[PDB]
Amino acid sequence: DVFMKKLSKDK
Numbered sequence: 001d002v003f004m005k006k007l008s009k010d011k
Contacts, residue, residue, distance in 0.1 A: 001009065
C-alpha cells in the first residue's frame, strides 16, 4: 500500500 494508503490506515 502507498503512503497515501497508509495515511488513511494510520487514521
